[PDB]
């Protein structure tokens, strides 16, 4: 007889998100709402493809005679464009040839890719994220081997970016550790650092010499494409080496076909070509070549004049309409009678802001309201519309 | 620099000798070398069942959502009927548990951190001559590779002697890797004898088996090219199974596997797929969409599913065929020796039996570009470029 080589594992602990869609589900109220969704939704409750999407499948379609093997690096245009997104068309930084692109399964990918490149090849041992946390970057980076640790970012009670503490939190980060920073859209506060606020951070590593990790999932979403980037773009100005993770899930609305990058910059080019050949060495032991369908969307959409204006028109809407909902929001509160201010939520940017409320409170709104939230107290705007945004906030009101 | 002092990493000499290879002027020159199918053409073009697929899916599909960690619950259930067959009683009784993957690749990825983090298994063995990317994939998560006894190059057979004997070392708690069908580089497969002999032993020794199953239906079809898979499913233990539909779908750039665990009973094999669906978390999260749908539509639709067989069965023959042809043609050519076990091995893939020296000439004198350990891959070979292709070779020897 021999144990069988599965017998001593104990199952992975139930997913709290599934379980709460479940409960949701079995909601026999009508008027329920669920503001705890991860991914857009329209004013009409759906996560529709997006037209533009649709029109570069249906060339895709019509025009792809092969689908053999790229290269590890995916997609040379689709890599072009990237880079142009992040730092913009007629880059120094890409006149020097300064960056190298791999396309990768999301930005989820990126961030794996970049982990085990730097687990295998520098001294890197720890990875700073922001307080609150998304809950993946943990779970990928320990995969490496890479400890990670937290600094100071969201004062929940004051609803702001605590600037102050969270320098002083990194005066613990070593040179030679990694920073992350969220490039727009912090997941899940919304709140983001002023353009003074990033050039001081990218001013500090340089002081300092950590390498900045830019994880860059919402560009568009918060003021505009240009203006995402700012941020980006301030640490580029200033730093010899940076990485960013890149997603096209939110923003082509391409969440289930994997579509992300990870973008080495070093000080020359001969520097960041050495370094990215073991980025691709990482990529050969992990899935190999990326997946093409959704790269070879944005590249179509990105690269065709037409269709690029078509997206970028697609795209401003959703933006706008998460800026109109946040105003709408405050504003209906203040309405019906909400005993305390709420400005903050227009100051945030993208779809995700925390609510304020305790875990208590959450609760009620779930067993008393039918309004879904999660734990945290995260919600996420897209999820409101015209039609349950009177309701939804007198139930806030109501637990207040 | 956080990057200043980092070794570049060694050239790539696949893509080397495609360098190579486009550079050469020659009109004449045959290119053995290729990984991918390619029809009578040259060409590697998508099928016409993945055309219509793809048709269907840009007018059904409504949104992109993210699906779960194990992606697209249709294309599991397709897999598990392809892996065990219908109305298995394997899968009555709810012993598999599948996780769509980014290729075959990703699935080896994902098998090999499910059992570094979550089991006792430090060492992987694998076939000599191995199959490069494996090494790479199992050191990457910490588990040492080693090699067992496979094919006899001299006489051109599986050394199943040897093989037995090398797995005498292999240890309770190990993994054991075997290619399922169309074994890559050699072609030389295990008899259906043979897979049940290597399936007794995993039980008595305590090995857990690791089939990587990347050619099913370029063998003999199917069904048998499944067979040694389910001989070792037989056993009632614990099996791992790394799928690709890259090559019997042509899906390679849409990343399309599966890793599918197997244990003695569903219970088992649910605590042991949670965690499985962790090491997925932790890498890339959900697997790509496109090319999944795509083989579900497929299987599940009669009319594309036909549609599909036929083409996977016209490769297959097409590759009987020239093995034949090359066959007969070193023969007319007056090659001094046998080659007649290019005729009993299996899928697009055979060992030449050139030494490197000839593999060199062979480029360098007549343009005829194998991989360096003397790989061809038949489906290279036309009527048309066979004569000259057979006289280069004769001629080396």
Redesign the interface.
């Known amino acids: 007889h ?1 144990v ?4 001593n ?4 602990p139930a997913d709290p998100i599934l379980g709460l869609a479940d409960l949701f589900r079995a909601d026999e109220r009508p008027g329920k709402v669920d503001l705890g969704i ?2 857009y939704k329209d004013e009409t409750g ?4 997006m037209t533009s ?2 029109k570069a ?2 060339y895709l ?1 019509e025009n ?7 290269g590890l690096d995916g997609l040379p245009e689709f890599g072009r464009c990237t880079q142009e997104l992040l730092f913009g068309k007629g880059s120094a930084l890409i006149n020097d040839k300064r960056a190298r692109t791999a396309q ?3 930005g ?2 990126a961030l ?1 890719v970049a982990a ?1 490149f730097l687990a295998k ?4 041992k720890r990875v700073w994220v922001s307080n609150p946390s998304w809950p ?1 970057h943990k ?2 980076f ?2 490496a081997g890479l400890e990670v640790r937290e600094y100071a970012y969201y004062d929940a009670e004051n609803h702001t970016l605590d600037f102050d503490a969270l320098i002083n939190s990194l005066n613990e980060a070593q040179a ?1 550790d990694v920073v992350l920073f969220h490039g727009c859209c912090h997941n899940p506060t919304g709140a983001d650092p002023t353009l003074e606020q990033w050039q001081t951070l990218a001013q500090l590593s340089v002081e300092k010499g950590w ?1 900045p990790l830019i994880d860059f999932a919402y560009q568009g979403f918060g003021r505009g494409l240009e203006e995402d980037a700012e941020g980006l773009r301030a640490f580029a100005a200033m730093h ?2 940076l990485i960013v993770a890149s997603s096209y899930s939110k923003n082509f ?6 579509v992300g990058a990870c973008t ?1 910059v ?2 020359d080019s001969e ?5 990215f ?2 980025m ?3 990529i ?11 790269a070879s969307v944005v590249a179509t959409i990105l690269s065709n004049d037409a269709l690029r204006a078509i997206w970028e028109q697609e795209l401003t809407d959703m933006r706008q309409r998460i800026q109109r909902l946040r105003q709408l929001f405050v504003n209906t509160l203040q309405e019906k009678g909400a005993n305390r201010d709420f400005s903050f939520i227009i100051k945030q940017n993208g779809m995700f802001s925390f609510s304020g409320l305790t875990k208590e409170q959450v609760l009620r709104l779930r067993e008393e309201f039918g309004v879904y939230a999660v734990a945290s107290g995260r919600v996420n705007v897209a999820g409101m519309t015209p039609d349950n945004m009177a309701p939804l906030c007198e139930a806030i009101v109501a637990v207040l």
């Open positions: 021999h069988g080589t599965f017998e594992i104990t199952a992975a991860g991914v759906k996560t529709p493809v999407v649709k499948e249906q379609l792809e005679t092969t689908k053999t093997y790229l990768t399964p999301g989820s990918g794996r085990d090849n520098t001294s890197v993946n779970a990928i320990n995969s030679g390498l010899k080496e609305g391409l969440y289930n076909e994997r080495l070093a000080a520097t960041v070509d050495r370094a050949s073991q691709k060495a990482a050969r032991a992990n899935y190999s070549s990326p997946p093409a369908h959704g």
